Symmetry: C2
Subunit: 446 residues, 2 copies
């Protein structure tokens, strides 16, 4: 009855149910996908993903202002999607760049991020003609300058700032000293020292400022404090160097962390509403300090890739576990685990799980969804409810696994990566194939 | 001065230091290994690993009583070492089995573990002639019974028990109801129901009972209570079925969790000492209930694989981070991260890290060792000390990364698995090659 419901904020946009009670994505029964492709299976609702690109692009004025964070999930097919939808792509190490270039992603729409970019990654970035590099340390700045001079080019950079704001859901914390790896402290003068260094060179050009402040952010307040702090530095810079050397500092990038619904009760605002608030903040903040309004750029991963994909599993074992003298928890063992979704164990993530191969009339029963790994903490959904007649051979799906589940996949217990399939308009296609024993053995020498 | 020291309880047994101040493993400078093989690099002290096998085998009476838990780290090379050293091998899913069989590991010395074994894994295990299956549910028992009967064989099994004991380091917790996925409860009567079920059939033979109680266990008291509880069931079983159908229940397997030193302060007892205590426990408990003393089996992963391997990295970036108005923490960015060692992030692991390419005279300074991934929490060693002159190009090593680090490796940010090398008597050989971009792209369709 209520265990049947697929909260529209949580599930992919193109989710329906059958007349026989099977959940379909983009018109295809989940049962047919498991039949054709096996389980576990990442199922991507392509129209959903593309929708999020378009709405976010519209919300921020242009696809140019929306940089997809590849770390959420990347492969050549997805790089193609982002390319066609007109967004930019943020890449983090050499491997993400090479996969983008392999996919012929236009390098001028690429930004390179990272706290510890090697010489060889910086080298490859400029050789490829990557549009922007977000610099994270004085050392990087030295390195990049030498590399750009060698190549005979002027590299566009942003400097990553630490502004003491950490935002999650409907709260944020402001600290005097952010104690983490990324960026340079505005407060300490470290950020201004970086700005000076970039100005002192010939082969680099400072075109913006970057901050990233959290994840699953549902309110604008963290961003507003962050924006105030970032533009305060802007004020400091053009104050010291004059609106002339600074004219080209045209971009404030407020990073990622746009929030999605994992659970029905999750309540991120519509992106159009949040984006307009952000736009008003940036204009207000810049006028408040006598500056022209900079371009606002945003770097979502989760908010593009997360909601449109589910993980489909087969129930293998159902065990009733005594938890008190009178209560029980129903442990439902499934086809994968921390190998394909480590987020529950790693971050304490909370997911929605539903029976998707039939409609049960059995009453709900408190449950834990667990994997097949030889570790007690191999838990996929810690606290949930299942039909009292859940049985091996039933299919269940976990929602919003499109971001950072596959990106984090391992071969723990020699469990190969699941296949990943894209559905569009009643048609399914394999995108990433499932790993085999040969894959498992492939790094072994002889 | 003291930042130079490599605690012998922490570092591989065949660690020394150069006269030029480079740490060698099995006689090879770590700087040479980084030069030949690149970083990050897993370095396996082969002799150390074998020694651990040999001393644990001796401590428990025989290699037959020591079952290496492959989940800690498995490849064909390692399966070979285990086989040669005369130990048994615990495998957890179909992939671990397949790797074992691929490496020619004797099936009779294999034991299959897991909470969610599929019909296909069970079927492959009996087809291979796997010596033991540790059954975890009533469902598994029914599946295996049918499988064994179809094969025309009698399958030896043990029943995994939950006895409400969870031990770590020098303590344990006893609970009325362990609320987790594995085993059947002695207290609720679920264990006895399973024993009856095995006894009901012709195609299975009950040879023993299994319990696994935690990790990093430094004392014997948790084991004692567990053994008391396990042997209590043994008494109920032979009571109800008579010393007859019960004569072949010859083994009490107390699982894994034997502890190693991650940090110089860590104090696991010598294995011979703990093994003797354990032996005494088993004999005492069985005699207290009028039973002959059962064989004692142990399933270590960490204590075999952990200490003999280190992870070698190159320092790329060094940033001093203000943490209060007066204090600072030195962020030392390295060559890998949560992709090759997720344990700090995942379980709050603590590691020992040391500068290995030179001797520093610089004073020590509070530090954090961090990877190159594009998230704040990509921390390898949260709280450590490094020399004040630590610089890009220096090599550092993290100790005791031989268990559960490679096992759990991912391609987060398209960062390929590092190379794994084995060193023995002044010779190094590549065991597992490092991933390339082609590996990263290999599951892509088109």
């Amino acid at each position: 009855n209520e265990l049947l419901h697929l909260a529209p904020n949580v599930w992919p946009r193109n989710t329906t149910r059958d007349e026989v009670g099977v959940v379909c994505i983009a018109g295809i029964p989940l049962t047919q996908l498991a039949q054709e492709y096996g389980t576990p299976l990442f199922v991507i609702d392509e129209d959903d993903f593309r929708s999020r690109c378009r709405e976010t692009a519209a919300a921020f004025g242009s696809g140019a202002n929306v940089h997809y964070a590849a770390k959420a999930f990347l492969c050549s097919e997805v790089a193609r999607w982002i390319s066609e939808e007109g967004l930019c792509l943020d890449v983090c190490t050499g491997g993400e760049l090479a996969v983008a270039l392999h996919a012929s992603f236009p390098p001028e729409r690429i930004t390179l991020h990272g706290n510890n970019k090697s010489v060889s990654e910086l080298t490859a970035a400029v050789k490829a003609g990557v549009g922007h590099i977000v610099v994270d340390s004085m050392t990087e700045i030295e390195r990049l300058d030498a590399i750009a001079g060698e190549a005979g080019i002027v590299q566009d950079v942003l400097v990553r700032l630490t502004v003491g704001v950490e935002a999650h859901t409907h709260e944020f914390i402001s600290t005097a000293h952010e104690d983490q790896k990324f960026g340079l402290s505005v407060a300490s003068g470290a950020a201004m020292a970086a700005v000076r260094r970039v100005f002192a060179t010939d082969h680099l050009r400072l075109v913006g400022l970057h901050s990233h402040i959290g994840s699953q952010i549902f309110d604008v307040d963290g961003f507003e404090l962050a924006a105030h702090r970032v533009i305060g530095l802007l004020r400091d810079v053009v104050g010291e160097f004059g609106p002339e050397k600074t004219a080209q500092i045209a971009t404030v990038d407020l990073g990622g962390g746009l929030g999605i619904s994992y659970l029905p009760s999750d309540d991120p605002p519509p992106i159009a509403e949040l984006a307009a608030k952000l736009g008003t903040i940036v204009s207000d903040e810049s006028t408040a300090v006598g500056l022209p309004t900079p371009k606002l750029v945003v770097e979502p991963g989760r908010a593009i890739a997360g909601p449109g994909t589910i993980t489909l599993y087969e129930v293998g074992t159902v065990k009733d576990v005594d938890v008190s003298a009178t209560a029980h928890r129903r442990y439902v063992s499934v086809d994968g685990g921390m190998s394909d979704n480590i987020r529950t164990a790693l971050y304490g993530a909370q997911y929605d799980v539903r029976l998707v191969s039939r409609v049960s009339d059995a009453p709900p029963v408190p449950a834990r969804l667990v994997g097949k790994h030889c570790e007690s903490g191999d838990i996929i959904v810690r606290d949930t409810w299942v039909p009292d007649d859940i049985r091996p051979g039933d299919l269940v799906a976990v929602a919003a696994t499109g971001a950072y589940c596959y990106s984090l996949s391992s071969r723990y217990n020699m469990v190969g990566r699941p296949a990943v399939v894209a559905v569009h308009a009643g048609n399914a296609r394999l995108v990433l194939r499932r790993e085999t024993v040969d894959d498992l053995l492939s790094l072994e020498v002889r």
